[PDB]
Amino acid sequence: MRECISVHVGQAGVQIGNACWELYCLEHGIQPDGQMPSDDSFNTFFSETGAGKHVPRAVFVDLEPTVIDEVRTGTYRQLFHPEQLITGKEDAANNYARGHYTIGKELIDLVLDRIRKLADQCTGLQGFLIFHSFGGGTGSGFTSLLMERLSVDYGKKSKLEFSIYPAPQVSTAVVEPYNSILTTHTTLEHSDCAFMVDNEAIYDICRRNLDIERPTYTNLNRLIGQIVSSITASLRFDGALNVDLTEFQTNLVPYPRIHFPLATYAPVISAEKAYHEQLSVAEITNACFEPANQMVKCDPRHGKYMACCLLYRGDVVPKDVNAAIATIKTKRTIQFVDWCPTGFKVGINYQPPTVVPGGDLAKVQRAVCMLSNTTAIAEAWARLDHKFDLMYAKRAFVHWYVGEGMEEGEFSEAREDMAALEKDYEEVGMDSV
Amino acid sequence: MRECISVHVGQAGVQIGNACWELYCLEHGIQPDGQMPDSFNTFFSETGAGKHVPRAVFVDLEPTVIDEVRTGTYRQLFHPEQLITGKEDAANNYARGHYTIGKELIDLVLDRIRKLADQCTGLQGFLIFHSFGGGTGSGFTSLLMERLSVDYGKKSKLEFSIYPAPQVSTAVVEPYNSILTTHTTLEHSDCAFMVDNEAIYDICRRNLDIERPTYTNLNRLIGQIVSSITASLRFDGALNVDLTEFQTNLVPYPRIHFPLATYAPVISAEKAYHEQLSVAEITNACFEPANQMVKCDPRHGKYMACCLLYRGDVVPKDVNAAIATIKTKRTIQFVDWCPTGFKVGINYQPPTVVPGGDLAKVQRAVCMLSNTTAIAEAWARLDHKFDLMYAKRAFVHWYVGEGMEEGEFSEAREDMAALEKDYEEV
Amino acid sequence: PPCVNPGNPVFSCMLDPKTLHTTTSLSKPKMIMYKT
Amino acid sequence: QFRERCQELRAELFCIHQKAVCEERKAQIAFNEELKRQKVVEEQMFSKLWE
Amino acid sequence: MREIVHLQAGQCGNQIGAKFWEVISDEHGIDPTGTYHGDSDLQLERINVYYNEATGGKYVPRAVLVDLEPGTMDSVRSGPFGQIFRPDNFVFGQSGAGNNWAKGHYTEGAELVDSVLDVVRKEAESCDCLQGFQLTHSLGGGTGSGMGTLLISKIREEYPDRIMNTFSVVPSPKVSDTVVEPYNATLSVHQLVENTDETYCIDNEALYDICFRTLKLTTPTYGDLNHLVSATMSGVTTCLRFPGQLNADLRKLAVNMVPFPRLHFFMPGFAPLTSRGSQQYRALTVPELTQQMFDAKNMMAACDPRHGRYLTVAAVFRGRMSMKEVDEQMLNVQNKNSSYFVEWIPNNVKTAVCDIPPRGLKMSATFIGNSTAIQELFKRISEQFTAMFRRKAFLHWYTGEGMDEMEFTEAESNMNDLVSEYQQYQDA
Amino acid sequence: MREIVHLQAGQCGNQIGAKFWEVISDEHGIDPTGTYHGDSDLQLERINVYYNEATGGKYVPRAVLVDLEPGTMDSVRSGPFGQIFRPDNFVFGQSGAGNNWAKGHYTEGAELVDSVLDVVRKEAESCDCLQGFQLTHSLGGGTGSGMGTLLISKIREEYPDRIMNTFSVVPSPKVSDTVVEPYNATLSVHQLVENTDETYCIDNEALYDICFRTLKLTTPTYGDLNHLVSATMSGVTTCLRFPGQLNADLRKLAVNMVPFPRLHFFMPGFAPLTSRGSQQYRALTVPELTQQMFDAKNMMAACDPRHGRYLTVAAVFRGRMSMKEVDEQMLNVQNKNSSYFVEWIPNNVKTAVCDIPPRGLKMSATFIGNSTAIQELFKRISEQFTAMFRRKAFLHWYTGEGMDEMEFTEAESNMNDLVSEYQQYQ
Ligand SMILES: Nc1nc2c(ncn2[C@@H]2O[C@H](COP(=O)(O)OP(=O)(O)OP(=O)(O)O)[C@@H](O)[C@H]2O)c(=O)[nH]1
Ligand SMILES: Nc1nc2c(ncn2[C@@H]2O[C@H](COP(=O)(O)OP(=O)(O)OP(=O)(O)O)[C@@H](O)[C@H]2O)c(=O)[nH]1
Ligand SMILES: Nc1nc2c(ncn2[C@@H]2O[C@H](COP(=O)(O)OP(=O)(O)O)[C@@H](O)[C@H]2O)c(=O)[nH]1
Ligand SMILES: Nc1nc2c(ncn2[C@@H]2O[C@H](COP(=O)(O)OP(=O)(O)O)[C@@H](O)[C@H]2O)c(=O)[nH]1
Ligand SMILES: [Mg+2]
Ligand SMILES: [Mg+2]
Structure with a gap:
């Protein structure tokens, strides 16, 4: 009788949700059309109608009709409500001002109309669960209006976003630094927690941990699928110790402006390699703080951990994890911050993870999901702020944004907003005596 | 719970390693799939199923040698993560393995040693195998051990350092890589062993009777030496002796960590019919200078200390007539401050019969680990060969043009000069 | 005619791509040229 | 629910789940070995179409 | 659900688009009468982009053909794919111009563009949500440049915030084809910078240099050139026609890679090009394709990029390929060649991935590139x-x-x- | 995995390299259509060292065929295996050199190098981690020596670390092929001394002397003459493609070859090469090779080692042979012929043993003679x-x-x- 509403926006957001919603159907035993092959575990991501049909609680919105069509006419045709699965009118076309002012404006009223029609069927609602990007117009500007309207229409609902950060070294869009700076005014005080999943983790974790070479985005999104299923399973599967969504928010986040954790899914190993070693609780916890396994291209040795939240799945005994935490706290390399001596959680769920057909993950007795808040993500903006001001200095690619109605001064307003946010991580990294 | 990491770096390391891990499987009862067809805590680290991945980090900087190790019969056995491969060779050059293709791969292999060292809770030491020939087995290991000494250190850095032969060699810059690695061995090595393999080139056609012996024959006999010293840990015994108990009874001073070892009953099948194997006799016969694998004549090198492994059906009364016989035979050299200078190594379990390998089914496998002053003679000839090139500076340009500097050759002289004097003034 | 101009500088598809199809034991038979 | 912590939770639940984990993985080593055969026959199809 | 409107002008623009309407017809499975003889359900879902429906089955093009001389007006109709167009869409003058930019812009240009503007507003009224306009023409003649100029001169009056892609054959570097091509070009370029949103330049002997060194065919007619430039034309407008994990339609393909609202002159190019002799010798993978994508010899403009610096480039990819290694190798292009790229935009390269390749090719790509080498x-x-x-x-x-x-x-x-x-x- | 690319220049060079690419294909089991036909996996192993994978199992001989004459290009391309070469790597010009070293160097030499270095770059970017470069040419031939001279002064600045070799045909100490040789040889060897890391001097006459008595063949046309140099090339690079116990690649060679970075002109030589009437008697085994390696009649360049001294002579072996039978039969050499052997380098021998032989022969070796006498x-x-x-x-x-x-x-x-x-x- 408790449930979590999801919204997936952007081309990046909709396809990482197709990997999310293939996993939700294969976790609870639900066919790709809706009916059970023949509990209350459905009532977190699934609504049960008169028949066996399980309509999904997500709403997929994007301004490109092209990417929304292959899920409209794909194997999940009968699953999604065809009026939930909402399309756009014209592409946002990699422009924040387009997705915020001129062409994303004619879709806010219909999107918020469907969030109201979905939240009243809700009875024990915990919070939203956002899915967008930082590069394109509808992944950045259209979600900015969403956080603008959901903050005033709902208020006390705890929203969480699984953002895909612009990669520091490779990149696919030229003006995506512009889109990743102006979105920060609306992800700071209009977002309760914000997960960052950069395209440098499965860039090389799928190469070193998994023996498969040449990964593509249908393998990128499965790891993003696994982590969200791991987080919400405490709402969804019983355990020796469960971590509610509101449980998870106030514990991991220190400060109202510091809500930008990292991520790590440790037992990512191939099928032909998994039987070569035992996967113990201590081993899989020691393998998750390693600087070659985090979800963002940032070295955690530069920063200090504030507070870490760990969610375990499946066969985990709650003594080995306490032995694992004590063993991994006494090592000097992983250094925590002084004003948070405990800095840890545990979370137990009985049900082991599923593996989708065709996946390169191997299924495990135990899976740990490590969610760490670091001040090493201070320099996540350092290679983006230098990425930003070099383009901004000579008014490059500015005429499009001011040509769509966005004022020039709102560029520098977002510039100083991130500069103040960088100052916060310099303030909290200083020890007090 | 008495475990060890069998690091194998360079070619001659892993070639001994395959011949090592062959007989290691037989004694612990493990198929090349890792399963059984605990003595195997020391090696063969526990996995989830009945598989056992070997406690080893097979490191190579050249693609090929590690590759047939990888695609061999031990492909399931040898875990791909501990099977570190390289791409550029060290060109049998200390400078390349230590600098140029050094820190390139030293980051992964320190992690790979560490990953198995996490499972290795109460471990005894590190079984590192390398030659004195080239940067894979000369330079990378000098980088490896000094990283291993600063991280772990107290763990035994017991090193199977394959020595260059007095006359034969694969290389011509063989004296260079040797005189560099030997002096870096002084600062970071706990109980570094010596494998000269030139008397191995002789006892093959005497005790083994293998005319036309090949590299394999040597490594199999070397792997038996590593087995006999470690069988004390894994298996049981009336006076079985720990790796810590070897080192702090054998090495007298910290710069004297260079003993010589030899298998005593190296007798093969054709003689084994006519051989009366009695524990007192073989260890008496062991001391004979034609048999010690290190060529430098122990007959003149004073027995500063001496350890005696005793493997197989060995009896405590019969190892004391063994001590007494060596004692009364005064012509066998003795040190003047240890009266006895013996370490008795009783081990019940008999040696394994490697498949096809010429070592016969001898009931006992008595071995011997004596620290002699003779190693100074092996150092002097090695030191002499280096001087002839380094007098008029031949082949130094390859070395100094690959991250190294000419003063290291000169300081290798002074550190070697201290090394012979360690084995001369005593 | 399988293609429009036999012998293009770029490419000429002289095979019916209908017969170009692969499948798994547990999957549906889909064509190669046409794809997502 | 109390003999679990001397017994049945181990050697009847852990060693039987592990027994599953062994045999269950063998399907993934068999299924992925079929999808690698897809690519190698697709390249034959892209070889004769290129030919 | 969005569409782009094609429209050709002059003898060059008529012939280029006639081959372009012939190279996208087999891509969408259209016979030379209009019926859909295809084999795929995702070949008909975006048929509204570059085609439109008629009285059942018959798919008619949406291109207007303005051509001041009728002697090459009957050439497109008499061709293999000439019956596909609707005849009243064809508009032509009674007498030719004579390669004057002014004569095709001022005196007989105004006699025809009232009808040409009449038929583009007739078709665009029927479209549901227009995405952009498309032109193909040449700068070196009055019927192509002058008539193309007068169309653009007042199409921005009625469609201000609609994008324009024009594929213009820029006149010849080495051996020229008309003696008044300096006059016709310099007034067209003056009028191609203030109103067009996005343009392409097509050097004529860059096609000849491709067909000699790269393709190595001894007797190439204009049909071989026209097919090659049209393959680039189809590669530009593919992402709004077929799905992908990262797509870039025309609006995205311009507004993120023109730094300033008057610099929009680009380097076109088609990636996979192989001779007959060397065709079993070339593997088909991403790293070999990019070594053919970015080199100077495989380019659609004769001017090399080694004399200038790339500002922004775009590379649209078609087919399943793991594009994580596409981002890996394209970075290797950035690192190996840093002096040929501007430093004030650290992000110079762009990707787009289309799920299906062109029919039969395992994987293909199209190169779009802005440079100071222009x-x-x-x-x-x-x-x-x-x-x-x-x-x-x-x-x-x-x-x-x-x-x-x-x-x-x-x-x-x-x-x-x-x-x-x-x-x-x-230098900035 | 490490790889090299051929750079065959001139009529002399293109014929040698094509005959070399002939033998390479036979040993790796490749047909003129590039399709793999090897009866095992070792013929593939590291096929990237010579061959680049193409569609349909095709392997192109990574090599650019630089020249200035269409006639040589026509002969090589129309050869039996001429089809396998890539047509884009057939960069050539029309104006001949006239055996003038300058004409192949500045008039059309310096006008075609930009195109050749473009497709030299083609091979280098395509291959992952290359090992070096190979270039067949003459000394007295204008386009062969001259264009090759300007390449080795251009690829060397492009890729310094990759050790680049030339199988330069040093001119005759007797009958002259042209009148121009002393000019062209002197000018090129002025750049050969400061461009290549190891130059293989090739005399036609001492190469005839093989077919005089060692092969005792009646009328040797240039076919087996090219085949003869190709045999040495194949065995030098054997440690990069074929598994071997003593894998000493060119990188392991050159650092033992060159004692001072000016001396790299060491005469190559093949070793079990015999005649039709002597194969009936000759016993393929280690000692009878050393007979016919260290003979003074098997040298490819003439420059007999009686009038010089062995600096650091080496021989890269092929085939399954003992490693204690080699050591002895390579040290017994020095101990005997002690004069040639320079006492300054105490053991100037490289035992470089490969496991698998050339197909069609059991016990093989390739002796690169590092005598001074060059x-x-x-x-x-x-x-x-x-x-x-x-x-x-x-x-x-x-x-x-x-x-x-x-x-x-x-x-x-x-x-x-x-x-x-x-x-x-x-
Ligand atoms: N994780 C993931 N990333 C993708 C996928 N498809 C494209 N991307 C990349 O992720 C980056 C961010 O995507 P978005 O910001 O959502 O791009 P977009 O929504 O299409 O841009 P607009 O629709 O014009 O607003 C893009 O630069 C793409 O290259 C996908 O399916 N999954
Ligand atoms: N394989 C092997 N080598 C031995 C043995 N005994 C002595 N050696 C010598 O040890 C050296 C081993 O070479 P490495 O230490 O790996 O250095 P390297 O010369 O660079 O060898 P590579 O890594 O193959 O390039 C050889 O040159 C041999 O001469 C033995 O029993 N087996
Ligand atoms: N590639 C290509 N170029 C053409 C073709 N027809 C004409 N051109 C080019 O167009 C330029 C002048 O053409 P023009 O007579 O002005 O054609 P118009 O614009 O329709 O009047 C010349 O440089 C030609 O090279 C064609 O069919 N293909
Ligand atoms: N195997 C072989 N050697 C050749 C051949 N042609 C020439 N040579 C050698 O090369 C020398 C002539 O070199 P040169 O004419 O300067 O070479 P060019 O520059 O290519 O013309 C002769 O003395 C031969 O010894 C050939 O076809 N095969
Ligand atoms: Mg988009
Ligand atoms: Mg090696």
């Missing part, structure tokens, strides 16, 4: 114009019937202003 | 130079192209310096 064409064609304007040569067919020399002077000033702005942004 | 072949061509040069015989062809007599003296002085250093180090 200067070595424009700085010379200004020199060609100034060497002929100061001597009062070939001018009485322009001044004697149309505009005065003041329009010629401001055309040179607008070029020379465009000369200075590329130079001053070359 | 300076006599150099002082021979120096005298032939100055005898022609001082009288100004025919150089207006050179000086008209800008090749003045000033650099002719520089070429003589640097090579006479190279005569001195070989002579001083003996």
